[PDB]
Every structure is written in structure tokens, then in C-alpha cells.
């Protein structure tokens, strides 16, 4: 009774529907965007946080300084403040093993944790999970008491994070020099897309530890005397050495949308290639850099005109920079198509050459700008290099406050480069995050709880002070967002506190009371024991005027009070609501045969709320 035309209609439709799914699966395997869900950065310039990096660059400050004496070293560089500081206790490491541990290992472990907190992931949920670790890093000489071999192998920098945090995806250390951290990023996106892992930590770390690297470059002559990088400037005279950590948390975008993760940005495509037969082992190749830029465009399905910002390798070398500018002019500088000139910069003008951490430090910068719609600024000292042809007008240095403007796709994109001395090159397209579009007991509150947690009391008060500073620094941040973050996007340790406030000003004030040992009205503190709760229901004495009248709204509360009302109305002449809510000719709370059944009702109802 169904014609042949109708039946074959439904099979054809199913076949082409199946074909659409197959081809969408193909696109996913080849080019799914990788969401960047978290980021951490411990870089020179007193930059302990990505937001510190934003402050440093919008304030036009750099970080070059004389070498520190804490290390056992006419000598200037860019050094991290707490390169040697490590909370060994937090990670279950003895101070004997911590001393023997390469600072690169220690900074990676701490920065990974902060990246996981930036992604709102309480690290305990990842134990036994399918999570990979991709560390770009290079061997330095820290040990030139026991546990010294495990504390200095490169492979353990990635595996130690897996061990401490209990992760079971692949853990690799990779060395491609200044490109190491973008290669680490590239490999992790391939790993996610292959389903080898469901989450990945990727980034890079370097700390100047042994005598070699600083004096090795001085004789070589690639160092500037200021210790300042002046990338794309006629005052270019070498790079300033640097160090740092910079990590990101990577997740397939489909999984990030599905778990409701705040996405900072997406890796839309990346490429990694080689200089090949160039003028020498350390010589950059402009044509190789075009090849890698164009491959990144291919794998992101975009063209040069769609990127408004380029974060370059920019080292400040007199002859290194023109090669990179040539390669950018031949790619990004042509077929601009009235998108305005591409804006060019290099975080190296502000923090020096972070070596294996250079690349993800550039990503972190780009993400900072993408948050705000603002081109990430660069120092730009002096005049534009005479060795470079900006005649076209299609490349401009990211001098100051610029609005970051989207492409025809209405999407804001940046390209990030890192070229290694070994010849291995990388370019990553970072796009702005897609639109994220998408039940409470104790409903109306007015006030809002902020819970805090740390492994020791002094750490707990420090968390209170730092959250106080952050909220004072950023008013207008919704208190419901602070609370939910502090409650759900953080792990809870043994020493705890909570402040209960109605406005950001009250939260700051009470957080600072927790930072001191103060006992003030809206503040509670204690330590978390397991052992279980005992509910205690006292005898006579708890009654008061319309006790818990304010709780009568809360639906789970009023629900319970209703059942008591039915039962008590049949058995006695009255009900609970008459006695608690306004009493219009209702039994007196002084009568023992009303207070005991009414107290019974309030305690059972409270226990159900609990």
C-alpha cells in the first residue's frame, strides 16, 4: 500500500543523511577545533598570572635586569622571580628530592596545576583519567642528594606530572628548541583528535640553571647588551635571554561544549615543518616559514585576510627579523582584501626570549587580547627596521591601544609563530571562542557564600587575601560567579573557611578578615574531617516568635510543613502554619500541646532541607 516511489524516497534520504554524518566525521578527524580551556603563565616581569602579563604589556614595561645572585653564576637578562620556589609538600615530595629536582620540573608541576584551575577542573576528578601531558623542554645543567637522575631526565618532566596527578594518557617531553612548546601543542591536538586522550596539558618550561647558556651565547654574539629584545626595530642588536612556564589545557571543542566548559579560544589549525637545506644549521629560511604559515591556513580553512593579528617569533636579531618580516609580507601582507593592515608584535619585547616557553607565552598573550577584543600590545622601541619593506602598508607594528577587529567570518583570529635554531618551525591559528549558548533550593538569598580551601592555615589565609585583592581590583564581577567558581571549579582541601556577603565590597572586607585571624560576624572556619554527621534533635527550649517563618517559602521546606499540617489538623484542632505564620486566633505557642508538635514539624522540615 506504499508505492515504490515512497519507499525508495525514505532509503535515499537515509543514505544521504548517513553520507552527511560520514563527511562530518571526516572533518572532525582532520580539523576539529581544539578548545583552549585553561592557561597558566609564570614568566619574567613579576608575571605569575596570565592577567599579570596583560598588565605588563598594556603598561609598556619590560623586564630586563641584571642576573640574580641566588643562582651560582656586564650581564643582563630576563628572570622569573620564584624560579627556585616550590611547594614540595603540596605534591607529596620530600625536601631531599625537591632539592635534587631541576627547577624546570618544579615550575611545570606548579604551572600545570594552575592551568587546571584556570580550566575550572578540580584536579582530583582527573585521577585515572585519560589525560595526556606534552612538555616542550630542553636539558639545562642544574646538577653539574639522590633522586638526581629522576630529577634531571627530560622524560620525567612530563611523566612526573602524570604520576603526581595520576594521569594515564601519553606523557612526552619534546625538544625542537624555541618551537618546542608549539610543537608540544601541535602534537597534543593530533593526540586529542586521534582519541589517544580526552584532555591534554601542553606547554613549555625553561629556567636558566647551569653556567653554559648565558656565557655560551655571549661568545656566540647573539645577545643584546641591554638584555632587551627590540623586534622589528632599527635598534635591533640581539635577543635578551629569558625563561618561564606557559601551559594550556586542550580539549576537543565538541567535548568542551558538552561539559559546559568556558572556552578561552580555539586552535583552528597548526602546522610544523622544517627549514631543510638552508644556509646553515642555524640559519632561518624565509621560504620554509611561508610553507608553514600556508599549511596552517590550509588546516584551519582560512586565508591570510582572516587573521588581524600576528604574534611573531620576534627575537630582535638584526638579520633574523627581516627574514621573518619577508615571509609575513609574502603571506599575510598580500591579498589583505581591505581587511586593514595586519598588526604585528612579539611578547619578547616585554619578557625576553623565553626559549622552550616562547611559543605558548605567545598564545597566552593572544588569548588575553581575544578576551577583551583588544590587539595585544608590544613595546616597539625606536624606529621600524630599515631592512624591511613596509611600503605596501599591509603590515603594521601593534604599537598601542588597538581594537582587534574580526574577519569576514565575524571571527577574531591570530597567527602565532615559533622558529627553532634546529630548523623546526611552527605556526598556530588561534580563533576566538564560538558562542556558548545553553533549579535551586534555598531560592531567594540576597547574600552569597564564598568557600575557601588550602592544605594549611597560612595557605588558607593567603588564598583569602589574594581573592580579596582580585575582587577589589575587579569590581563588577558577579558575586554568583565568584561563589560558583570557588565552590565547584576548585578542589577542597582540609583547612576551610567561608565568607557570606551581599556585595563585592562586603566580600572583600570579610575575605580580609579571614586573611587575618579575625572572628567577625559573617565568617566561619574549620577543618574537614570524615567520620560522618550526627543530627541532634534537642528537648524543650528551641521555640521563638514564628520561628522559621522566613523559611516557609523554600519549596522543600513548605512541602514538609504541609504534611504536618494535614496530620496535625486531624489529630489536634489546629495546624502548624497557623502557629508559625501570622496567628489569626490560632493556638498559643505557650501551650505544651502546641509547642511540641510545632517544634516537631520545624525540626523534621529543617532536617529535610539539610
Amino acid at each position: 500500500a506504499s508505492t515504490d516511489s515512497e519507499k525508495v524516497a525514505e532509503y535515499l534520504r537515509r543514505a544521504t543523511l548517513d553520507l552527511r554524518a560520514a563527511r562530518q566525521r571526516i572533518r572532525e578527524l582532520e580539523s576539529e577545533p581544539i578548545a583552549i580551556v585553561g592557561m597558566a603563565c609564570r614568566l619574567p616581569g613579576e608575571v605569575d598570572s596570565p592577567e599579570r602579563l596583560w598588565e605588563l604589556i598594556t603598561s609598556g614595561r619590560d623586564s630586563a635586569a641584571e642576573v640574580p645572585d641566588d643562582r651560582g653564576w656586564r650581564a643582563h637578562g630576563n628572570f622569573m622571580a620564584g624560579a627556585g620556589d616550590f611547594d614540595a609538600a603540596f605534591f607529596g615530595i620530600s625536601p631531599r628530592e625537591a632539592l635534587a629536582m631541576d627547577p624546570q620540573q618544579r615550575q611545570a608541576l606548579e604551572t600545570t596545576w594552575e592551568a587546571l584551575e584556570s580550566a575550572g577542573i578540580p584536579p582530583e576528578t582527573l585521577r585515572g583519567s585519560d589525560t595526556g601531558v606534552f612538555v616542550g623542554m630542553s636539558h639545562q645543567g642544574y646538577a653539574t642528594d639522590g633522586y638526581l637522575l629522576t630529577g634531571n631526565t627530560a622524560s620525567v618532566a612530563s611523566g612526573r606530572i602524570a604520576y603526581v596527578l595520576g594521569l594515564e594518557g601519553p606523557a612526552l617531553t619534546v625538544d625542537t628548541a624555541c618551537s618546542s612548546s608549539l610543537v608540544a601543542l601541535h602534537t597534543a591536538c593530533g593526540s586529542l583528535r586521534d582519541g589517544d586522550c580526552g584532555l591534554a596539558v601542553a606547554g613549555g618550561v625553561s629556567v636558566m640553571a647551569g653556567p653554559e647558556v648565558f656565557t655560551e651565547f655571549s661568545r656566540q654574539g647573539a645577545l643584546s647588551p641591554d638584555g632587551r629584545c627590540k623586534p622589528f626595530s632599527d635598534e635591533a642588536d640581539g635577543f635578551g635571554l629569558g625563561e618561564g612556564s606557559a601551559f594550556v589545557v586542550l580539549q576537543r571543542l565538541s567535548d568542551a561544549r558538552r561539559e559546559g566548559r568556558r572556552v578561552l579560544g580555539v586552535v583552528a589549525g597548526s602546522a610544523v615543518n622544517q627549514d631543510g637545506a638552508s644556509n646553515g644549521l642555524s640559519a632561518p629560511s624565509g621560504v620554509a616559514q611561508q610553507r608553514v604559515i600556508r599549511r596552517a591556513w590550509a588546516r584551519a580553512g582560512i586565508t591570510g585576510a582572516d587573521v588581524a593579528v600576528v604574534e611573531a617569533h620576534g627575537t630582535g636579531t638584526r638579520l633574523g627579523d627581516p627574514v621573518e618580516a619577508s615571509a609575513l609580507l609574502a603571506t599575510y601582507g598580500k591579498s589583505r582584501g581591505s581587511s586593514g593592515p595586519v598588526l604585528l608584535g612579539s611578547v619578547k619585547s616585554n619578557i625576553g626570549h623565553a626559549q622552550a616557553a616562547a611559543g605558548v607565552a605567545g598564545v597566552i598573550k593572544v588569548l588575553l587580547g581575544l578576551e577583551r577584543g583588544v590587539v595585544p600590545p608590544m613595546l616597539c622601541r625606536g624606529e621600524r627596521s630599515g631592512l624591511i619593506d613596509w611600503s605596501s602598508g599591509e603590515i603594521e607594528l601593534a604599537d598601542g591601544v588597538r581594537e582587534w577587529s574580526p574577519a569576514a567570518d565575524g571571527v577574531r583570529r591570530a597567527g602565532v609563530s615559533a622558529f627553532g635554531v634546529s630548523g623546526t618551525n611552527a605556526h598556530v591559528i588561534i580563533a576566538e571562542p564560538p558562542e556558548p549558548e545553553p533549579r535551586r533550593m534555598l531560592p531567594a538569598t540576597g547574600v552569597v557564600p564564598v568557600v575557601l580551601s588550602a592544605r594549611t592555615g597560612a595557605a588558607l589565609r593567603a588564598q583569602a587575601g589574594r581573592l580579596a585583592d582580585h575582587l577589589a581590583a575587579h569590581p563588577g564581577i558577579a558575586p554568583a560567579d565568584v561563589s560558583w567558581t570557588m565552590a565547584r571549579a576548585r578542589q577542597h582541601f582540609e583547612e576551610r573557611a567561608a565568607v557570606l556577603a551581599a556585595d563585592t565590597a562586603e566580600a572583600v572586607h570579610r575575605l580580609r578578615a579571614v586573611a587575618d585571624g579575625a572572628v567577625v560576624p559573617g565568617v566561619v572556619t574549620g577543618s574537614a574531617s570524615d567520620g560522618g554527621s550526627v543530627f541532634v534533635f534537642p528537648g524543650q527550649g528551641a521555640q521563638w516568635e514564628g520561628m522559621a517563618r522566613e523559611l516557609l517559602p523554600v519549596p522543600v521546606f513548605a512541602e514538609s510543613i504541609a504534611e504536618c499540617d494535614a496530620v496535625l489538623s486531624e489529630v489536634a484542632g489546629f495546624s502548624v502554619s497557623e502557629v508559625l505564620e501570622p496567628r489569626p486566633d490560632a493556638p498559643s505557642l505557650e501551650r505544651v500541646d502546641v509547642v511540641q508538635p510545632v517544634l516537631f514539624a520545624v525540626m523534621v522540615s529543617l532536617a529535610r532541607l539539610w
Binding site: 596545576w113 568556558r262 593567603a462 554568583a480 567558581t485 565552590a487
Partner: peptide, 27 residues
């Protein structure tokens, strides 16, 4: 906490306040 308050949004608040001693081997 999610049943009591509802779900809000993640915001970039400070991370854990690590309490580091210095370790720097001088071999």
C-alpha cells in the same frame, strides 16, 4: 552547592597559593 545556589559561570580567580621554600642546588 549546585543544588543550593544553581549553576553560574567560571571566572578567572587566583589559583592555589603555593607556599614555596627555595631549593637551588649548587654542585
Amino acid at each position: 552547592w549546585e543544588a543550593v545556589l544553581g549553576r553560574a559561570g567560571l571566572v578567572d580567580l587566583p589559583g592555589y597559593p603555593f607556599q614555596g621554600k627555595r631549593f637551588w642546588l649548587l654542585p
